[PDB]
Design a protein around this motif. Structure first.
Motif, short mmCIF file in Angstrom:
data_model
loop_
_atom_site.label_atom_id
_atom_site.label_comp_id
_atom_site.label_asym_id
_atom_site.label_seq_id
_atom_site.Cartn_x
_atom_site.Cartn_y
_atom_site.Cartn_z
N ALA A 144 13.05 10.59 34.67
CA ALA A 144 12.51 11.30 35.80
C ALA A 144 12.69 10.55 37.13
O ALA A 144 12.70 11.16 38.19
CB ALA A 144 11.03 11.58 35.56
N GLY A 145 12.82 9.23 37.09
CA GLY A 145 13.12 8.44 38.31
C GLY A 145 14.63 8.29 38.54
O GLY A 145 15.28 9.27 38.85
N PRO A 146 15.18 7.05 38.38
CA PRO A 146 16.63 6.80 38.54
C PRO A 146 17.63 7.48 37.59
O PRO A 146 18.81 7.54 37.93
CB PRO A 146 16.74 5.27 38.36
N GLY A 147 17.19 7.96 36.43
CA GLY A 147 18.04 8.75 35.53
C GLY A 147 18.83 7.92 34.56
O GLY A 147 19.53 8.46 33.71
N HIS A 148 18.73 6.61 34.69
CA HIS A 148 19.37 5.67 33.79
C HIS A 148 18.48 4.43 33.63
O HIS A 148 17.55 4.22 34.41
CB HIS A 148 20.75 5.28 34.34
N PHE A 149 18.78 3.60 32.64
CA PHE A 149 18.07 2.32 32.53
C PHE A 149 18.82 1.28 31.76
O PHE A 149 19.73 1.58 30.97
CB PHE A 149 16.75 2.51 31.84
N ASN A 150 18.43 0.04 32.03
CA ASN A 150 18.75 -1.08 31.17
C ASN A 150 17.69 -1.19 30.11
O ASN A 150 16.53 -1.49 30.41
CB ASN A 150 18.79 -2.36 31.96
N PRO A 151 18.06 -0.93 28.87
CA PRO A 151 17.00 -0.80 27.87
C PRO A 151 16.27 -2.13 27.57
O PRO A 151 15.05 -2.12 27.25
CB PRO A 151 17.72 -0.25 26.62
N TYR A 152 17.00 -3.26 27.70
CA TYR A 152 16.51 -4.60 27.29
C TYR A 152 15.19 -4.95 28.01
O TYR A 152 14.21 -5.39 27.42
CB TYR A 152 17.57 -5.69 27.55
N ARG A 153 15.21 -4.75 29.31
CA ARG A 153 14.04 -4.94 30.11
C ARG A 153 12.80 -4.35 29.45
O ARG A 153 11.73 -4.94 29.52
CB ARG A 153 14.34 -4.29 31.47
N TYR A 154 12.93 -3.20 28.80
CA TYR A 154 11.75 -2.49 28.28
C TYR A 154 11.50 -2.75 26.81
O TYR A 154 10.38 -2.81 26.35
CB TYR A 154 11.88 -0.97 28.58
N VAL A 155 12.55 -2.88 26.06
CA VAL A 155 12.39 -3.25 24.69
C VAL A 155 11.71 -4.60 24.56
O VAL A 155 10.93 -4.80 23.63
CB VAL A 155 13.74 -3.36 24.02
N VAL A 156 12.05 -5.53 25.46
CA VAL A 156 11.64 -6.88 25.27
C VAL A 156 10.11 -6.99 25.39
O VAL A 156 9.42 -7.70 24.62
CB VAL A 156 12.36 -7.84 26.21
N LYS A 464 23.44 -12.39 22.28
CA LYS A 464 23.18 -11.23 23.12
C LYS A 464 24.45 -10.48 23.54
O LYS A 464 25.57 -10.96 23.37
CB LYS A 464 22.51 -11.69 24.42
N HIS A 465 24.24 -9.32 24.16
CA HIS A 465 25.31 -8.57 24.83
C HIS A 465 25.08 -8.66 26.30
O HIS A 465 24.00 -9.00 26.69
CB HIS A 465 25.33 -7.14 24.35
N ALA A 466 26.09 -8.40 27.12
CA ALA A 466 25.87 -8.26 28.59
C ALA A 466 24.94 -7.11 28.89
O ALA A 466 24.92 -6.13 28.16
CB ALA A 466 27.17 -8.03 29.32
N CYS A 467 24.20 -7.22 29.98
CA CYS A 467 23.21 -6.20 30.29
C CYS A 467 23.94 -4.87 30.56
O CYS A 467 25.03 -4.86 31.08
CB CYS A 467 22.33 -6.67 31.46
N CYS A 468 23.37 -3.76 30.12
CA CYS A 468 23.92 -2.45 30.37
C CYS A 468 22.90 -1.63 31.15
O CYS A 468 21.81 -1.39 30.66
CB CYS A 468 24.21 -1.78 29.05
N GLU A 469 23.24 -1.23 32.38
CA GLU A 469 22.31 -0.46 33.24
C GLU A 469 22.42 1.05 33.03
O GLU A 469 21.61 1.78 33.55
CB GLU A 469 22.53 -0.78 34.73
N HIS A 470 23.38 1.49 32.24
CA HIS A 470 23.75 2.90 32.07
C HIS A 470 23.09 3.64 30.89
O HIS A 470 23.61 4.65 30.43
CB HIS A 470 25.29 3.00 31.86
N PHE A 471 21.96 3.21 30.37
CA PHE A 471 21.44 3.96 29.21
C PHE A 471 20.75 5.21 29.72
O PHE A 471 20.10 5.18 30.79
CB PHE A 471 20.48 3.14 28.33
N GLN A 472 20.87 6.29 28.95
CA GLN A 472 20.14 7.51 29.26
C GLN A 472 19.47 7.97 28.02
O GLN A 472 20.03 7.83 26.94
CB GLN A 472 21.08 8.64 29.65
#
Ligand code: HEM
Ligand SMILES: O=c1cc(-c2ccccc2)oc2c1ccc1ccccc12
Length: 477
Positions: A144-156, A464-472
């Motif tokens: 509902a905000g930016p429409g994408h996310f980096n999932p790691y930030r939130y999973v962690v 780890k993997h490189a950060c991905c900002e494109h998750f939807q």
């Protein structure tokens, strides 16, 4: 009639340091193709024996456990838990074994045991369910905000909250700064503590300007301080017959030990109490990393996200949230989790071992005190064991009916073996399952076409993997 382990020639001063390169697990797997299951290299001037092969590794870690349960005295380990880490210190004697037992009881008692507040279900299922929902909610706020996310930030944060609940009886909002500063801010713990770190073998690299090592020291100081802040609060509020969490059980154990007459001095209060940090550290990082890979794989293999979605709908329906008890009846979810473990082998080597005495292994002599690496990536990618090691194929664990092929699932080695095997293994398997089952039943993850998603592991203890900002994410029909 015993030989030295074979291995290639090395530079006289730096040994095989440059051959290990940036991906020691790959280099040493190649090397075992030539020299076998027990081989020897040198990093700087330090010999290291390197082990591969299911059976060879089982032979050493299990059948000769006591021989190989040591840890080598590396510099970098002296920076963890104030030089007194259960998991990383050179101590593999009876003090260690006693600490190991307390951690296991701590874990069992505060995870697998029945939550008093719930007849039906255990603590772990309780905390994972709570955090699964909050996480769903949170991800919505971002779509509902930016429409994408980096999932790691939130999973962690979600994952940290589970193991945090178990150890410290607390949890944290997804925007709490102090927490994010702990588990999402220059967390190079794994990077430096990976087998083969040159700084542990080339003395000068320690004293030169070294941003990595300074960051690693700051990280450890912060974790230690956090443990200390948390332990004080538990003391201040301790209630004598009400053990809330693992920290309380360790406080209790310390208390009981004060009325022994000949109280053993070596198992200090500090070493009893900082146990909680080794659990918390291991618990947040490895499980976060596992789920993060699982997601990357889902979003690169929509075929598999769908097949799982299908099995959930068929076996449970969208009538209720899933539960631990459904784990046994969801063998495709199992296959997908196994193949995440195998394919990524995101813990490619165990924490390094050390020989506790002169020994021999497959005819090779190995002197006491020898640093040993144990290559799990090699087992999980061995071309003689698997069909296309390099391909992500959950189906490899399934029989023609669609049951888990038990014999084949047992060849995924990612938790170690023997005396130094993960003590978090059952929590880890249940936590990943639940988090996935609850999430995938209700949402769909995707990434668009035309964006880079780097799927290359970055070496370390956990890769780890490189950060991905494109998750939807999108809710399900
Ligand atoms: C996917 C999840 C996990 C993986 C793959 C994993 C893997 C491992 C591995 C490979 C080791 C090294 C064994 C060795 O040095 O021989 C290890 C040790 C350990 N694991 Fe885990 N682990 C995971 C989750 C957890 C969790 C959730 C906890 C605690 C809550 C935990 C606690 C530990 C501890 C304390 C050790 C040290 C054991 C010792 O040094 O004697 N692990 N784990
Ligand atoms: O990120 C970590 C992973 C891990 C870890 C531990 C065991 C196995 C795999 C990862 O540990 C820690 C981490 C961070 C801080 C720690 C402080 C003390 C002890 C362990 C810590």
């Amino acid at each position: 009639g015993l030989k030295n382990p074979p291995g290639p020639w090395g530079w006289p001063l730096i040994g095989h340091m440059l051959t290990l390169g940036k991906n020691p697990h790959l280099a040493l797997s190649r090397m075992s193709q030539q020299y076998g299951d027990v081989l020897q290299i040198r990093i700087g001037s330090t010999p290291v024996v390197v082990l591969s092969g299911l059976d060879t590794i089982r032979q050493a870690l299990v059948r000769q456990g006591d021989d190989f349960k040591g840890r080598p005295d590396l510099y970098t380990f002296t920076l963890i838990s104030n030089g007194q880490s259960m998991s990383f210190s050179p101590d593999s004697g009876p003090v260690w074994a006693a600490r190991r037992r307390l951690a296991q009881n701590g874990l069992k008692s505060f995870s697998i045991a029945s939550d008093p507040a719930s007849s039906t279900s255990c603590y772990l299922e309780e905390h994972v369910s709570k955090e699964a929902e909050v996480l769903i909610s949170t991800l919505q706020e971002l779509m509902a905000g930016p429409g994408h996310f980096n999932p790691y930030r939130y999973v962690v944060v979600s994952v940290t909250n589970v193991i945090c609940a178990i150890c410290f009886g607390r949890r944290y909002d997804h925007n709490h700064q102090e927490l994010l500063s702990l588990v999402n801010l220059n967390n190079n713990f794994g990077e430096v503590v990976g087998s083969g770190n040159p700084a542990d073998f080339i003395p000068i690299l320690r004293y030169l300007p070294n941003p990595s090592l300074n960051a690693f020291k700051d990280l450890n100081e912060k974790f230690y301080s956090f443990m200390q802040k948390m332990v004080k609060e538990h003391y201040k509020t301790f209630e004598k017959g009400h053990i809330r969490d693992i920290t309380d059980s360790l406080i209790e154990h310390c208390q009981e030990k004060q009325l022994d007459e000949n109280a053993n001095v070596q198992l200090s209060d500090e070493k009893i109490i900082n146990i909680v940090l080794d659990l918390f550290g291991a618990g947040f990082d490895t499980v976060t990393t596992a789920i993060s890979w699982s997601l990357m794989y889902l979003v690169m293999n929509p075929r598999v996200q769908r097949k799982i979605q299908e099995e959930l709908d068929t076996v449970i329906g969208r009538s209720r949230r899933p539960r631990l008890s459904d784990r046994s009846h969801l063998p495709y979810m199992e296959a997908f989790i196994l193949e995440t473990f195998r394919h990524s082998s995101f813990v490619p080597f165990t924490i390094p071992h050390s020989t506790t005495r002169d020994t021999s292994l497959k005819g090779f002599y190995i002197p006491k005190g020898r640093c040993v690496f144990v290559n799990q990536w090699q087992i999980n990618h061995d071309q003689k064991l698997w069909v296309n090691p390099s391909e992500f194929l959950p189906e490899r664990f399934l029989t023609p009916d669609g049951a888990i092929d038990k014999v084949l699932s047992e060849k995924v080695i990612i938790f170690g073996m023997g005396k130094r095997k993960c003590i978090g293994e059952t929590i880890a398997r249940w936590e990943v399952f639940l988090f996935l089952a609850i999430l995938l039943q209700r949402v769909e993850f995707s990434v668009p076409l035309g964006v880079k998603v780097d799927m290359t592991p970055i070496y370390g203890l956990t890769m780890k993997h490189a950060c991905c900002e494109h998750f939807q994410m999108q809710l399900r029909s």
